[PDB]
Amino acid sequence: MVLPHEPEFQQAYDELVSAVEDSTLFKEEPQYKKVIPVVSIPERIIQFRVTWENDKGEIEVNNGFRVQYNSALGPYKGGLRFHPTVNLSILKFLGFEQIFKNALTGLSMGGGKGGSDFNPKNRSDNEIRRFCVSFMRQLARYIGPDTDVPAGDIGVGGREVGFLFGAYKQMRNNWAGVLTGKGLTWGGSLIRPEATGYGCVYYVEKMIEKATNGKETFKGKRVAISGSGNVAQYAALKVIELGGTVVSLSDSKGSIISKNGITADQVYAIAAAKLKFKSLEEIVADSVQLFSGDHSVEYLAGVRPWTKVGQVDVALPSATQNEVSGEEAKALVDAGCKFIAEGSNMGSTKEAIEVFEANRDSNGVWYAPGKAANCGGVAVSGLEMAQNSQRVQWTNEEVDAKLKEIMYTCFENCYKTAQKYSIEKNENGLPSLLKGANIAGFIKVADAMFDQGDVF
Amino acid sequence: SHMVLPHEPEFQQAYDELVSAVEDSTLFKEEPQYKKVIPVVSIPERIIQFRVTWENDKGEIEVNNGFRVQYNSALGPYKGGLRFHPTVNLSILKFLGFEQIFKNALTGLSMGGGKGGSDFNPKNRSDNEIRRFCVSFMRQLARYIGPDTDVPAGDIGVGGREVGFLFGAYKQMRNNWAGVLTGKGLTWGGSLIRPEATGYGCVYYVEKMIEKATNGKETFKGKRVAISGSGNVAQYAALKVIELGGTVVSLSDSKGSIISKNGITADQVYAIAAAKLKFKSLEEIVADSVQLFSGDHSVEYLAGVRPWTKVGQVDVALPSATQNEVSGEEAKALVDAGCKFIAEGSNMGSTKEAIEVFEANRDSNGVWYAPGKAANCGGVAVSGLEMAQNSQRVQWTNEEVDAKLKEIMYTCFENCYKTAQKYSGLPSLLKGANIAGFIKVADAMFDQGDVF
Amino acid sequence: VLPHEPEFQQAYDELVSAVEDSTLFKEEPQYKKVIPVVSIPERIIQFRVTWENDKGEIEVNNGFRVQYNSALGPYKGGLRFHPTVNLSILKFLGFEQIFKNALTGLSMGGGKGGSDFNPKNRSDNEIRRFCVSFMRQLARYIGPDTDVPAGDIGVGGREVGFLFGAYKQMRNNWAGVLTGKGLTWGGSLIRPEATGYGCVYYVEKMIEKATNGKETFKGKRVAISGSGNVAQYAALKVIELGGTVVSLSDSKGSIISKNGITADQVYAIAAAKLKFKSLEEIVADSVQLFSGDHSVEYLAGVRPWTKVGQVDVALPSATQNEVSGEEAKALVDAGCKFIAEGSNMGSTKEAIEVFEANRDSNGVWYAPGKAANCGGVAVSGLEMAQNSQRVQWTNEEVDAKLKEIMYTCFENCYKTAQKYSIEKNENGLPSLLKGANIAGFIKVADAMFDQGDVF
Amino acid sequence: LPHEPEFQQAYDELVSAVEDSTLFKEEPQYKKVIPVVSIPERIIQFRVTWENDKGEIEVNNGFRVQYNSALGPYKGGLRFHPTVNLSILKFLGFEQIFKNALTGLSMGGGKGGSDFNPKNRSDNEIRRFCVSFMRQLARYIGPDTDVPAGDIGVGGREVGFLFGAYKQMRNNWAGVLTGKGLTWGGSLIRPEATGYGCVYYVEKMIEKATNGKETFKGKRVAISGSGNVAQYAALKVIELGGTVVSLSDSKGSIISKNGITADQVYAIAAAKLKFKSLEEIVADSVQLFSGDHSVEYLAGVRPWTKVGQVDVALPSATQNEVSGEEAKALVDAGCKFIAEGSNMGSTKEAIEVFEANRDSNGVWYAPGKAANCGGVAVSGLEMAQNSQRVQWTNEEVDAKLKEIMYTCFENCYKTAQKYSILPSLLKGANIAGFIKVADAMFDQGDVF
Ligand SMILES: NC(=O)C1=CN([C@@H]2O[C@H](COP(=O)(O)OP(=O)(O)OC[C@H]3O[C@@H](n4cnc5c(N)ncnc54)[C@H](OP(=O)(O)O)[C@@H]3O)[C@@H](O)[C@H]2O)C=CC1
Ligand SMILES: NC(=O)C1=CN([C@@H]2O[C@H](COP(=O)(O)OP(=O)(O)OC[C@H]3O[C@@H](n4cnc5c(N)ncnc54)[C@H](OP(=O)(O)O)[C@@H]3O)[C@@H](O)[C@H]2O)C=CC1
Ligand SMILES: NC(=O)C1=CN([C@@H]2O[C@H](COP(=O)(O)OP(=O)(O)OC[C@H]3O[C@@H](n4cnc5c(N)ncnc54)[C@H](OP(=O)(O)O)[C@@H]3O)[C@@H](O)[C@H]2O)C=CC1
Ligand SMILES: NC(=O)C1=CN([C@@H]2O[C@H](COP(=O)(O)OP(=O)(O)OC[C@H]3O[C@@H](n4cnc5c(N)ncnc54)[C@H](OP(=O)(O)O)[C@@H]3O)[C@@H](O)[C@H]2O)C=CC1
Ligand SMILES: O=C(O)CCC(=O)C(=O)O
Ligand SMILES: O=C(O)CCC(=O)C(=O)O
Ligand SMILES: O=C(O)CCC(=O)C(=O)O
Ligand SMILES: O=C(O)CCC(=O)C(=O)O
């Protein structure tokens, strides 16, 4: 009646809260009970009209948001999303996620997220540029390299980051790390494109190693991936590089499934075309030869790939929120899936997580939440901030190694934390990475909040 | 693409009222360019939400949500009050700021549209808790306001005490002394008619309404006036009605109404004001002052009831409490009781149904409704006069501010009347106010490139 | 351990004892909470001021700005360039300024600043370099809505001009950041005369109330100390009103006459003091003006109070602690019935004790500086109003506003002293000291409570 | 000028160290510097209004002295103690200028604090005060302007409350303060920094004085105070094989002969966090301070005279905590090495005694601005980590601290020798810092 209905935010909130209460944490230190109703209310939200001009010279209006959620661990850090579904609820769920994700990267980065209900698809680069300019001119006053460092997300990539950076510099007359994901010649980092997907696959590497005592790797594993964006493209490429077989990709209109695995050239063509806002249907149509040989793929319109891949070992939802239903989760378990890790933010529904966790101690089915598995993107963003602040640019190998080490440490932190605060430690079984990640992030943020007087 | 925007019923009510007043006129046909403005002006230029953390008297941590909606800055810096009330959310404050744009436009002063507040509840709370909350609030807010950017003021739950605490917090954070807020204390930049402003202005507007409706043959002399609420607006509306020879037949608050038949007296309003400063109920106020409410000026307290149906024959109604406090049925009850003049002291005091009833009785039973964005604009007008006094480094006399308020209210009535007639018995002041304010704001937005 | 600050403690004790010896804390005890808050300045700024003299050598001085209280408005106060300047003196001055400004009825906070830099007998080039250095250290912390300084001892129109230029060069803004500005770049017309004219207007109202309009300044002997802006224009107003100015003084000696100092003598003193001349040197340089029927006796190293015989009015207009208890007794014995400070805290506690002890018996009426000399800051506030309105008022308009401000101040002192007196003598003069202190304190304290500065 | 005895003490010490040398004769331009550098660039005093747990209004004085910024942004701690006044903070900031100069880092001089007393006060009252203080102060500091830190009465808890207040007012997350928590931008050796650095400096002192024939091995070391400086100086002395014969606090001293143990220091630290006296801590943990490692508590007395034969003395408590009589008592007790963990720990009389016995009895005195510069050095290393957006390992920071302290020792020795007439480490440190700061002031046009 008073508070507005914000279901996605409430979903993320409930996931974290139920992970924290279902543990020994409040018993061992009840002071943490004070923290939940404070950290969950954002330090600041900024909504603004974004007025711009389309190619016909008509006036267009969209809503722009920047949610600066938590700054205990550092300046606000988070991506920007341009998608017609964007509202305060979605951005609140994303920023709440981001707080504890950033806590898991071990770098000094606060939580935030922003975007607009602007729809960039099938739009000219001129219209995108005008909207980014107007948007950043509305936002510039409230961000800065020590205050709030946005980046990309759905609908926001290198092109959009470039337009935004230029607009910011024209308004504020500063050249600094006000954004991450910048171009390599004007302050970018080398592994930032690959970061999220590579990090997800590294995290699943460590998962597999722990689950099989080093007896299995990504070697010969069937991997079902959703989405076809930055996360999905580079997760697929790393799975291919590590000897797995990528059996699926998807987008907003359908899925593509193969049985022998998607090839790297196919991912490259998909990436190039997705830059041009092509559907997977249109790309399998445009490159008939490339998607028809021994590496042919079947395009299934209107369907998510989880049920359409048969036996599968690993599942990497890498598209959007709530893209794995309870039904799809049960189907994955029945199809032999033993590793599910979100490259997307809150990719799994509450029901999917219930299924995965209920199959954990019995079928060895191991689920890792996005705030742990996909934190490589913000991790390498923070590394870009480090390079910018140091006025240096690191090599490919240096950033990749730091990314690998950050992902592995995050896995170990999830595992050991889940063990430390488990109510009944079922030995010969796998501890909850969900609970582990949520509790580790919460403890770090809450300790810092106490220290700084944000809670008492 | 579906159901993205959050549910904001109060904002949509204000929006629909203004839009339907603008569409049902010759305005879009005579100049269709105005059609471009509705979807731009209706999206606020800027909104700021912030956590307000404070400490209660036990040393416990309390958390509330704070908002400042800076809606439109075409005609001047953002101008609007602050509301501390447990119902506060983005929707209510958006409706209030959207209203405020065109209200401020009707005052003829250079004032943009805005509004703010928090779901903090000050009722029965110590002045220490109020002070701590105001400090935390203003510390989160100051960075975004200024005497040339955004000049907040009071509203429900925010009066002189809260404005003072907020001003102190602002001065400590920003190290400047200026008209960053209106409704300030007289010794540190306030104006003399600002407390009285809203109710006095409502009564002045209804003065001009009655004069036009009766060709100067009737005044407030001997009129039965039903007022709701017992706050700043209602108190001073009642006092002005008394001074003008009317009989105030009712007041109310969140728990019940009080009704009289000889009229409420000025001493009764003074006692109610003093007691409401300490968060007393009207029930408790008639209990605590038995002598004052029992003679020929006795009052009956009706718990849980609004005064509209409980007053018998009534000539004028001044809802001066909150939004949506006059139902369609209560509007019919007023019409049946002979009510011919209705002017909102509160913001959006009438439901859409009540406005439909009054307008449907306009040409036939001569029932004349005036919306809040016209009638209660005296408060923000005298706020702007406070801003002018601050900018000039002067303080005006009682009569100077009272006269400027009077002329602004009368000019507002004349503008509503002429505009209602120009784009169409008694003309609809609802349409008049909405269209006049809309035209002024939209011309300024066109001139400044906010719309093209 | 608190540092020794005698001048500040003097002003503090004066105000505190005026408020305690009244019905005030009985009528509203909440005010007791305000004394230990308001008496600690909101902010103090100390800074090194490095400059270059005419030989091209580096000189170093201390610069201060004490921003004491901002409840009633932005910090308002003058700047003093004098070698005795330290934090203690400026704290007393800014503390004074709080309640003085409160009495002017304008929106003005309390503050004061300056430097131990000594401008006497120094070239205009050295003064310009020092003003530039000083204002560049200070500008970051002042502004037309934050802190509006002006002149004082050692700082006049020339120094205000250099300061305004340096500020405009650093901050790139043209606004009322200072008062006492030149007429062509944002100044006001009565500001030079303001303090002395207002002091004499206050004594006008004093005489009127004390004698039921039967006496005026007509035919009164008036002893003035000092020879600066306050003293010059107080003397000119006394002359214009038909009185006889029997003395002036400076840091080296006094000048005494028996027919009264003339306006032309005052003009010459002003012109020569602009060039840092002593009274000895000015009576030597203009022998023609100081030798006829208007001859003058120069007494080196002496204050004029004991050296004038019978005198009716005394206007100390030079510096702090310039009337000792002995000089107060001498003035009482010489028949003085009106004493009003043109300088800030001109009288020692002993002198005030003498005057107050003779109030109800000999009708001897003392008015403190925070009431009597508030005309200067009042017209400075009017300069701020003119700048804010982008208008400049006529001579007569500002002079009239000054007169009404001074009269309002006297009436407030009188009525406030009577309202809260525990002397309760039907007959007798009420304490203007207590009146001014209590009225100013009440206004400032109410504002502090409203704004949450005290709770 | 107002009476400022502590500032004048520090000023006179530095000036007499510089004048009693060949410096002004070799290059007389330095004569212009003393009356400039000794006047602080800027001082900010402000009322700090706060609210106690009873809801009553409390008022205190807050100061920030930004003394000299030639070598970098102002760097200095914050002291909450009822004795705080402008004189004390001026003495500390004047010291800090040349201390920072000796650390070889880009750090100006400054110091601040309040007469607020944190003793026996609830964490809520401390948080409210820190909030009021930092909200009054933030406008004048910044990661490139003035980076405060802790001192007496201000530790990790207070640094946390202050950092929160600053971030809430200025909306920036950066290295505006040092001594921050490890999880929000802190450094790994910062707690240990000052005492560890003092002990490393005395390592090099002993080494130079005996040509490497002696170390801290088997030496009697008398420590005063029981705060951060004293705690970690004691821990480093223990780790290096010395015997800690004493500690002290504001109420009395504790003395033993078998050496203070690490567990005892840990308990003292935990209890001092709750504002317990040494009397109360030896009472509350009788087992830990009465067994084979028992300790004798002498109330109201400084430990220097109550420890018998002693080799090293580390005053680690406050200013003017070693009198001339106590200096003679230490010399007679066989002390040959004295290094101040506190700022201006020794009185003029104690320093005169030590220097007068230097060339004859080989007693070596090192001033605090050289010996205790490890704390501000690791503060600067925290600043470097923040600016780089990195956090270093324990070993990395410990090694950088060690090398900085050793470099400072060599600079003291070499500079004392270059301009003299065992060399005086006092004059060495003072002259090295003065030369660096003065050259920088000349270059930037602060002196001409
Ligand atoms: N980019 C980064 O660095 C980071 C991204 N993430 C998370 O990964 C997920 C995707 O990121 P990213 O690769 O950058 O996004 P992209 O814009 O690169 O692509 C997103 C993919 O998801 C699909 N998709 C988008 N919207 C919907 C929808 N409403 N319903 C169904 N499918 C949809 C898109 O299909 P189509 O192309 O047809 O529109 C596209 O295939 C998000 O949850 C994001 O927050 C997490 C960490 C960092
Ligand atoms: N103050 C001003 O200058 C201006 C005010 N207004 C409008 O006037 C109306 C009230 O103004 P104001 O006098 O300042 O407010 P006040 O706080 O002084 O009092 C408001 C009155 O309305 C009653 N009331 C408040 N909320 C509710 C509710 N949710 N349900 C039922 N009754 C309620 C209150 O009852 P109770 O005392 O029991 O809480 C109180 O009597 C608002 O619509 C405001 O926006 C318009 C122009 C300017
Ligand atoms: N100027 C203004 O607008 C205001 C001034 N006042 C107060 O009035 C007094 C003087 O003001 P103003 O006329 O403008 O100042 P000026 O600089 O114009 O002159 C001050 C006069 O007092 C003499 N004098 C100054 N200091 C001392 C001293 N320490 N000991 C002895 N004699 C001294 C000077 O003598 P000489 O120069 O010949 O050596 C000079 O004649 C001060 O107390 C000031 O605070 C109050 C209100 C406003
Ligand atoms: N902290 C740092 O990094 C650095 C510190 N220093 C200097 O070291 C000294 C202490 O620092 P720190 O350890 O952090 O402070 P702490 O507040 O942690 O403790 C200081 C110790 O000295 C005692 N003490 C404090 N004041 C007095 C006094 N007036 N008279 C006698 N004994 C007293 C205290 O006793 P009790 O607890 O009972 O009050 C406590 O045992 C200061 O002079 C400081 O300037 C120098 C370089 C850096
Ligand atoms: O790079 C960042 O700022 C965060 C990346 C991102 O979009 C996320 O973690 O959700
Ligand atoms: O600005 C003011 O005077 C209060 C504004 C307000 O709430 C109104 O006019 O309805
Ligand atoms: O003009 C001002 O700002 C103050 C004038 C002055 O010198 C004083 O009142 O002390
Ligand atoms: O460590 C710091 O940064 C402040 C300096 C200090 O406390 C000291 O060395 O005395």
CSV table of N, CA and C in Angstrom, one decimal, chain C residues 245-276:
chain,number,residue,atom,x,y,z
C,245,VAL,N,32.9,70.2,20.3
C,245,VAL,CA,33.8,69.0,20.4
C,245,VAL,C,35.1,69.5,21.1
C,246,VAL,N,35.3,69.1,22.3
C,246,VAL,CA,36.4,69.6,23.1
C,246,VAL,C,37.7,68.8,23.0
C,247,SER,N,37.7,67.7,22.4
C,247,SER,CA,39.0,66.9,22.3
C,247,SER,C,38.9,65.9,21.2
C,248,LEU,N,40.1,65.5,20.8
C,248,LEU,CA,40.4,64.3,20.0
C,248,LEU,C,41.7,63.7,20.5
C,249,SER,N,42.0,62.5,20.0
C,249,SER,CA,43.2,61.8,20.5
C,249,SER,C,43.7,60.9,19.4
C,250,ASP,N,44.9,60.3,19.6
C,250,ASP,CA,45.4,59.2,18.8
C,250,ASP,C,46.3,58.3,19.7
C,251,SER,N,47.1,57.5,19.0
C,251,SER,CA,48.0,56.6,19.7
C,251,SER,C,49.2,57.3,20.4
C,252,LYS,N,49.5,58.6,20.1
C,252,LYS,CA,50.6,59.3,20.6
C,252,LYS,C,50.2,60.5,21.6
C,253,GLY,N,49.0,61.1,21.4
C,253,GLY,CA,48.6,62.1,22.3
C,253,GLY,C,47.2,62.6,22.0
C,254,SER,N,46.8,63.6,22.8
C,254,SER,CA,45.5,64.2,22.6
C,254,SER,C,45.6,65.7,22.2
C,255,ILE,N,44.5,66.2,21.6
C,255,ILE,CA,44.3,67.6,21.3
C,255,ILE,C,43.1,68.1,22.0
C,256,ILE,N,43.2,69.3,22.7
C,256,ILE,CA,42.1,69.8,23.5
C,256,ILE,C,41.8,71.3,23.0
C,257,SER,N,40.6,71.7,23.0
C,257,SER,CA,40.2,73.0,22.7
C,257,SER,C,39.1,73.4,23.6
C,258,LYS,N,38.7,74.7,23.7
C,258,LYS,CA,37.7,75.2,24.5
C,258,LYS,C,36.5,75.8,23.8
C,259,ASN,N,36.7,76.3,22.5
C,259,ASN,CA,35.5,76.7,21.7
C,259,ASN,C,35.0,75.6,20.8
C,260,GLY,N,35.7,74.5,20.7
C,260,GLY,CA,35.3,73.4,19.9
C,260,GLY,C,36.1,73.3,18.6
C,261,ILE,N,36.3,72.0,18.2
C,261,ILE,CA,37.0,71.8,16.9
C,261,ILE,C,36.1,72.1,15.8
C,262,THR,N,36.6,72.6,14.7
C,262,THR,CA,35.8,73.0,13.6
C,262,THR,C,35.8,71.9,12.5
C,263,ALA,N,34.8,72.0,11.6
C,263,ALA,CA,34.7,71.0,10.6
C,263,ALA,C,35.9,70.9,9.7
C,264,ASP,N,36.5,72.1,9.3
C,264,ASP,CA,37.7,72.2,8.5
C,264,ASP,C,38.9,71.5,9.2
C,265,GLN,N,39.0,71.7,10.5
C,265,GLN,CA,40.0,71.0,11.3
C,265,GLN,C,39.8,69.5,11.2
C,266,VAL,N,38.6,69.0,11.3
C,266,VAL,CA,38.3,67.6,11.2
C,266,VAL,C,38.7,67.1,9.8
C,267,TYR,N,38.4,67.8,8.7
C,267,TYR,CA,38.7,67.4,7.4
C,267,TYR,C,40.2,67.3,7.2
C,268,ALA,N,41.0,68.3,7.7
C,268,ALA,CA,42.4,68.3,7.6
C,268,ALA,C,43.0,67.1,8.4
C,269,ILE,N,42.4,66.8,9.6
C,269,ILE,CA,42.9,65.7,10.3
C,269,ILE,C,42.7,64.4,9.5
C,270,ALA,N,41.5,64.3,8.9
C,270,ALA,CA,41.2,63.1,8.1
C,270,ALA,C,42.2,63.0,6.9
C,271,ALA,N,42.4,64.1,6.2
C,271,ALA,CA,43.3,64.0,5.0
C,271,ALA,C,44.7,63.6,5.4
C,272,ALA,N,45.2,64.2,6.6
C,272,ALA,CA,46.5,63.9,7.0
C,272,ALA,C,46.6,62.5,7.6
C,273,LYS,N,45.6,62.0,8.3
C,273,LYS,CA,45.6,60.7,8.9
C,273,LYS,C,45.6,59.6,7.8
C,274,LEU,N,45.0,60.0,6.6
C,274,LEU,CA,45.1,59.1,5.4
C,274,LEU,C,46.6,58.9,5.1
C,275,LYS,N,47.5,59.9,5.4
C,275,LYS,CA,48.9,59.8,5.1
C,275,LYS,C,49.7,59.4,6.3
C,276,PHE,N,49.0,58.9,7.4
C,276,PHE,CA,49.6,58.3,8.6
C,276,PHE,C,50.4,59.3,9.4
